[model samples]
Structure formats: C-alpha cells, structure tokens
Target: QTKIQKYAGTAMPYPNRTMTPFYINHLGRHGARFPTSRKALDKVEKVLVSAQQENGLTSEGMALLSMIRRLSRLFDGQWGKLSKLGETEQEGIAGRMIRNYPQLFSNSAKIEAIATYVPRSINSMDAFLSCMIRHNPALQVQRSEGKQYNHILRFFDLNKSYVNYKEKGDWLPIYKAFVHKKISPVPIMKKFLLNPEQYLDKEAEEFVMALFSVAAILPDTSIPLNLEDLFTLDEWHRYWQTQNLRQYMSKSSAPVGKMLPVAIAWPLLSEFIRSAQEVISGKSDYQANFRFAHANTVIPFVSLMGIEKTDVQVCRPDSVSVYWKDYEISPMAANVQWLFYRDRDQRIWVKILLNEEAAALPISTACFPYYSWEKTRIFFNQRIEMAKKTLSVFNE
Candidate 1:
C-alpha cells in the first residue's frame, strides 16, 4: 500500500495572490514555461515507484525523507538560503551555487524575479503545495545513490583532490596519483599565475570573483541582461539581501510544520540558482545544463584568506545521487569543476568557473575529444579576469 504523499500533484484551484508566484511559470532552464503538471509529476512518481518496488519496505520513501531533512539542516529548516544572505556569506554561497544550478541565474530579470519570489507573503497553503508536487518526491521521486552510479567516488578519484592545489597541498599527491591512473588530462598550467584575492579573508567576495571570472568570457551575450554586472550597488544589495532574511521568514506565514510558502522561500533559492547560471551559461539562461551544474565540488584557495576553521555542508546532496564534493570530467565535453563547503554559515557551493570563455576552457577528459579545451579555458579565464578588474574598480 502507498500513501498519497500528502499533497501530491496539487494544483491551484483558486486565485491565491501569495501563491500567484507559482504562476510566473517554469524557471525555463528545465524546459517549459510553467509549473510541472500532473503528467510531469506522474513521470517523477513512476521513477520513485520503481525505486520503492525495487527496494521494498518503503526504503525508497525513507531515503527521500532523509534527503529533505539532511538538506534542510543546512538552512536550519529553510531551503535555499542564498538571496537573503549578506556580503559575509555571499562568497561561500556563490562558490557553491556555480556548481549546482548554473542556468537558473544567468539573467537579471530572472534574478530579480527570484529575489522577489523569496520573500512574498502568503495566506494559502494549497498554492505552496502546487510547487511541492512538481519538485517533491513524496509528491515525486526519481533515483537514489544505489540506483545511480558511483559518480561521487569517481569524481573524488579524479577532480576533488586537486582543487586549489597551490594551497590545498594535501591534494597534490592525489592529483599525481589520479594523473598516473587516468592518463592525458588536458589543460595543463599555461601561466600558473597566482591571484591576490585568492588570499583574501572574504568568502562572499571570493565567490563573487569566481563567478565574474566565468561570466566575463562566456560567449552568451544574454549574460549582461539577465545578470547585471556586479555593480557597486549590487554589492550593497547583497548586504540588503542579508538584512531581509528575518523579513522573509516573517512573510512566509507557513503552518508550523509545513516546508514553507513559495513566495517567501523561492527568492533565496532562485537567486542562488540565477547567480550560478549567470557565470556558466555566458547569458544566464544561455544553455540547458552547464559543467558547473554537476561539478559537485569546489576548491577555494581558502588558506590565502586567513580563515581559522574549514567546514562544509551540502543540501539534497543525495538528490543528484552523486558525490557531494566529487568532480567528474564531462564525458560529452572538455571542462573541469570543483565543490567547496563553508563553515560559518554551514553552506555548500559548487565551483564551475570555466577555464576558458572567449576561447575555450580546458577539458580534463580528452580520450574522445569534443570541444577543444583551449576554447573553453579562454572563455573562463576571460570571466576571471573581468571579476578581478571589477573588484579593482570598487576598491579604487
């Protein structure tokens, strides 16, 4: 016997202003223009059912519940706590965001819309349920780790150990071992230049820099429109985003135990997603899924920053059923990605900064050869350079 999973496949039957945020339609990156319909939910449900049937005694259901709870712990019950963050935490979140949902934040309007969505107040519970059905597994389920390949492990064996190698010395041996085992990793060190900001103590600033580095070179012309440059005001706005966290919580008005109202919750989640995409897709929504989306790992030249402690946290890490911080060179392309975790805020972000933008970034896997790593590296390096230049202007 199966439970209905509560509000599974719920649709907004009435006009709910707070819930109207759902009507804004799909984030677009995942395809389609609106929320997931029963058909989509049913598809997701079928996947979950398969999982449930394969592993009896509700093992699959329990896994889904665990993912929500484990991921929720990062935000202290609130999900996607990115938009309502301050300068202090922005860098950490930004670093991780790039690796998770790269296409979501590529545009300015979408970013603003996400910010708006994060804090709206709502009186209706049904409307909130509408979103849950589309994304929720109790509402829907897809796959779990056992069902998925050992991607995280493979990533660890390949990419995770070498991130920030100039500073993460321990990873040096791991990198060498992997190179010996894997053979012909492309994108060798060209200049091996060291960056000053790599040594800064600011987490949010560092994350922003990483994103800018990737964004500046991406070929997508839309990046400028979807995500405005990190103007001085945008930096300040980051501060404003933080102050409004409490305000967002107040606006939620969710029942004591419910997940949260979309109006108040989606803003931060969506903002984080938008920011990640802005860097990866050149233009925010430039392409479907970028390398950063599944990089699953980030390496910050953290020691350069003078931080006393190192901590990492990931949300729904199992949702993707891959390594929380492992790296996997794209089989279809030539690029690299990393995962990073922050201590103070207990947030995890993925680093998908393109090695190339205008030209092309390097691809770790070259056995088959698709896009030239040279072109990709240029694209990413251009963005990194732009970020440095932008930061210089502000300090000036």
Candidate 2:
C-alpha cells in the first residue's frame, strides 16, 4: 500500500440501472511518470559511486550499486517525461470510463478536457482523449489551457502558509525526530557499506531510501527492478514508512493539511459547483469535463471535498500509521469522480467516486449513494463559507 504511486489495475462496479448517468467529471492525477528529475536517481548513484571508488562496498553493496546504475540508465537524459506505462495507464482509465458509462459517452456527446502546463499532464490528457475518440469518433472533445484552469490544477502554489510551514515551521524538527526514531536505517547501512559511517550521512540515507521507494513502484511501470534483495522484511517496512512520512508531511494532509486544502481549493470547488449548476440548469452544452493534474492538486481537492475516508486526523509528529494513509488519498493516476444523475422527475442526484470506487459522501442523506442536490449544495455552501473565513486568517 505504501507503493501508492504504482499503477495497480482494479475492476470497477457496474452502474446501477435506476439512475441514468447524465454527466461525468474527473480530476485525474498524471499517470505513472519517471522520477520527475534526474537528481532523484543521481543522488543514490553518487553515493554508490563514492563507495565503489573507496572499495568500501560489501558484496550486497556491490549488487545494489549495479542495480542503482541500471535504474539510472533507464532514467538517463529522459528526466521528467511520462513513461510508456503512464500513457497506457491513462488510456486504460479512459477506456474503462467508456465501458462503464456507455450512455454518457454516446456518438455525438460533447466532452471538454483540460490539463496543466506540465507536459506529463498534457500527455495524460492526450492519452485519455485519444482512447475516448477511438471508441466513438463522433464524440467532440475540446482541449484548452488558461490561467484560472492552471491555477485550479496547481492551487498549492498560492498556499503561502503551506510553503512556509514546509520550509521553516516548528513541525519540521518534530517530523525529523519522528523519522530518526521510527525509520532509522543505520543497521541496514552497516550491513551494506564497509565504511558505513562515512557513507551513512543524511543525504546518502535518503538517497538509498529513495532508490528503494522508486524500485517498489517500478514493477508497475516500464522499468521493472527488484530492490528487495538489499533489505529484510523489517527494513523494507520502515523504508516504506519513510516514503509515507514524506508524502504526509509535504501534502496538504499534514497538521495544517485540513486548513491548507480548504484555503487553496475553495475557488476550485466553487468552480465545480458552478459548473454542475450550469449543467443542471441546461446553461452549458458540455456533457462531460475532464481535468488532468498532479497528486498535489487531487489530494488537496479531495481533502477540500471532505470525502469520508480522506477526512482523518492530521498526521501529528507523534501520530501512528492509522492516522493517515497515503495510498487511500494520493496514488499514481488517482482521481475523484462525480457522476450526476437526473431522475424521471428531473430531480438531480450526485454520487462521488474515489479512485473509481463508490465512496461515501461526508454529508448525511436518506439515499445511500445518491444525495439530493439541494441538501448537497447547502452542505457545500456551509463548507465554502467556512473555507473563506479560514483562508482570510491564513492570508492575514
């Protein structure tokens, strides 16, 4: 589960016949991508190269060095590009949408898809649109980019508090202390490096752990490599926890995670509400909207939506694993889907899907999966007001 970024395929449930699918909206995180930078693998390779030159590498260290070199070769000169697996992942997700909701994606249906300025996002949009177009050539898919849309996709950039907290907040020291206590790799380092003291600095420790972290997810991507040969069961688990800590702290799910999302995502959620209202009022011709972005965007937006599972205790420096789970929130190709249904009487119902699975809405309702638009809108309005107030203070 810690290898949340890996692309694991699942079977989606069949849509119930009672509610006709009127509209489909998706916020897709870019699919399985290469280590967004060469520095990611370069750091690990640097440690390995230094160890090799000093003749301080054990038999296990030599094997690891070779594997690291091989992994580096895969990412060499192709930094930050979407791997072949990423394209296939998008296509598969789009294909499943077509298969699952055939009625909504009819021959003459209108679809609008947008992506961030990031090339990976644009590629993901392309892959998804191409697959949808292939299935129904008559479908019209509009593609465009604008400042507001990009801001919606990358809202965290506007979150000055979150940025400051990450850089210099009191939380940083506590988080570091927690990692040093819970996820120490000292024993593992001694076993691999002959001169463990010299090579076991903070940067090197993180580099080795980063290599394992990426290796854990590589199997799902085009680059398949086994890093398990280097670590025992206990060692691997602690290593995975390190990855979890990094994600939990860096994303909006931190202690201020809840507030950060609300502050940053209110405008975007307002957009979502307006768009849905327009569609329901027959004021918009577009039948479906698809947004391509990153985990940073999707995770916060999900937090803002107040989805039941995603609404958990902020990960305190002293928190346990149960407090926050990364796999449950942000994974490679992770998405939150809203399926709108209008009954025979024209009463609108909204259903939320998290990661393509039916997810419970945070609001109460008589209907299980479907909630009344009036009730849902009221709930969202209350939330929006609260968010505005929260953002006001943070801005001040």
Candidate 3:
C-alpha cells in the first residue's frame, strides 16, 4: 500500500492578466543541505563495514557498501554545508520567480528578505538575492536577522513545549510504532546480504534509511553514482512512508501530535498577513518579503494554514498513511508564496503558491485561489485569535 513520493514542480494556471501582480510574501525552506552530522552516516558505515569484514556481504552488498563509502567521502569536510546542487535549487527558483512576474522585480522595487541564523538558510537567501540582483542590479533588497527576527524565522525553537518535545523524544514511542509498521528491515537485509537474519535488524534499517536520506538530496548531483539503483521501488516506497509518518507526527497535522508546533507558527503566519495588509494599505513599499528557514518551520506553518487539512483526522494510527504526504508539504527549498494582485477596480486579492504551484486557502474565498484581501484578512485574524488561545492553554 506504499506509494513512492517523487519531486515535482507544478505549474500554476495563469490568472488572465486581469489582476496584475503587485506584492509577494514568501516563506522558503532552505535549499538542500549536506548531511548535518556525521553520526548517522558513520553508524551506517560501521554496520556495513562490520558485515563486510565478517564476509557476510553478498555481491550486491559489497557494491552497496562501495557506493556508500563514496558517498561518505563526498560528505567529508562538507557536513552541515550547502552543496552546489543546493545553490542551483535556490537560483533556479529565484530565476523562475523573476521570469514569472517581471513587474515585481522592477529595478526600483524594494525587496525585504529574512533568514534563520543557520548558514544554509542564509546561503539560500544569498543565492536567491544574487539571482534577483543579477537580473536587476538596482533592485534594493534589505536583509533582516538576529534575536529580533528569531520569533518569525525560528519560532519552533522558541516554544518551550515544542523544543522539549523535539529534543526530549516525547513522541518517540509513536514514531517507533509508525516506523516499525511501515518499514521492515528484513527485505532490505535480504537484498543486501547473504545472511539476512544474521545482521542486526535495527542497524540494517538505519543503513537503508541513511541511503534513502542521501538519495533525497542527491538529484542532479556532481557525484556520478545512482543511489536509487541500489533499492527496489518497493523498498524506496516503504522508506518514504516511514519519512512521511515521521514528518506528519513531528510537524504536520496529527492532532495533538502537531498541534503545539502548528500553534507556534501563528506569529510568522500573522507576519505574512501583516505584510500583505501593509502593501494593500500603501504603508509598505516592498514588493516582496522573503523568509528562508527549515522544513520544521515550513511544515508547521502549512499545517497552521490548514492547507489540505484532511477531513479525516491524522491522529489515529490508521489515518496517517492515507491523509498526509511529506514531499508535497516539506521538500527541499519548499516554499509557500502569497501573491497579491490588484484589478482595474483597485480591489486587492491574494493567491497562494505552495512550492510554486497554486493552492487554495482553507477559508471560503471570494474566488478560487483569488480571495479578496478583506475576506483574507478576516480569516487570518480569526485564525490568529484561535491559535493564541490554543497556545495559552498549551503553555500552561
């Protein structure tokens, strides 16, 4: 019942040019980054090398470990860094934004950008700005960071309950069961080793998941190896499902599972709304406000927005597999953009683009994708009030 998740950049249908693009409020996940730590890959290496030393590896196992060794070497001195591919991802998205809406990137237009303190997020912001500046050297882009911006850029880390849940593993039992049900190590072990049962199941699963993680960010890699070639479609799908479950529990809508994280995202969501309001009210001159952060932030923010919030609750064990999908919610450099447009009547409207593809708001809009700014403001204000009440209860 597992389906493989693939990366896709969907095209948004044109808005008939009646409503011209005026402003954009964007939240972007950082471009793909190198393995943040060595421990995971090191553990994978330990298991694979130990198995090989025991002369337990099949011909395929040897090939797999050799590929892993090469992958490990590629990460040397590169941990927690942005890869060349990561840079391209940022630049490509920025180029597309420029091409899609030339009016917004006018020579005199001002752009406000913010990024988390993390280097990869900052680099992503830099890569995007560099592309925009190249297209128009006169484009004024103001940068914002530091403690004052932390609430907007890194809200999850600031929420004590969320921080504790993330660092203390309050949800570990739930994640363990979800992973155990969705992914089985036996199949991976059989494919990679002659003595499948002889290997430690936990260690084997860790190795396969590590390879899967590498493959996620390996698209168009400078490294000339096919990590996907080592695993069957079924194996990859199972591994992907495990990841989907983890993201759902830890970030997306899973009732209590993600409620706190979603609540903490309100501050940023309000910021996005406020920026749009300022533009519509002529109080702000910036054409766009771009924020770059992590998947943890993007996922919770989307959940808070109630985009694709399923009718079926995700808290139940059986509901998760069918309700939530990770790639659509939190892919590398994933972004949600609120594009504002004004018609001939001077009435403003908002349309959202999730990962560059048009998406609808959960609230009833004046029109599909294009909601009147007045209606949108009311909807967002209500959500903010509800979130604040929820967070008060949570903090207590």
Go through the candidates in order and give each one's C-alpha lDDT.
0.24, 0.70, 0.73
Show where candidate 2 strays beyond 4 Å: 1-18, 146-148, 195-204, 256-258, 315-320
For candidate 3, lDDT tens digit of each residue in 140-195?
A: 88987656678887887888877777766556777777677777777777777777
Candidate 1 segments exceeding 4 Å error: 1-75, 79-154, 157-356, 361-396
Q: After the best TM-score superposition of candidate 3, give how far the Cα of residue 69 lies from its true spot, in angstroms.
A: 2.1
**RMSD after Cα superposition, model 1:** 25.8
Please give the TM-score that candidate 2 achieves against the real structure: 0.89
Scanning candidate 2 in windows of ten residues, the lowest lDDT window is: 7-16
For model 2, residues 302-358, the per-residue Cα lDDT tens digits are 767777756465545545355655566666777788889888888888888877777
lDDT of 1 by residue, 1-396 (tens): 011110010110111112001001111000001121223223323433444455421443444434323322332323212111112122222333333444333332122111111111110111222332323223221211221222321122232322222234432343334223322111110011122123233332333333222222111111122122322333323322321221111111112101111111222233334544453445643222221111112111110110111112213212211221111111111122222222245332222222211111233424322232234334434434543443343331
Per TM-score, the best of the predicted structures is: 3
Better model by lDDT: candidate 2 vs candidate 3: 3
Q: Per-residue lDDT for 368 in model 2?
A: 81
> Which candidate number has the best lDDT?
3
For each candidate in turn, give its C-alpha RMSD to the true structure in angstroms.
25.8, 3.9, 4.0
List of clashing residue pairs for candidate 3 = none
lDDT score, candidate 1, position 262: 14
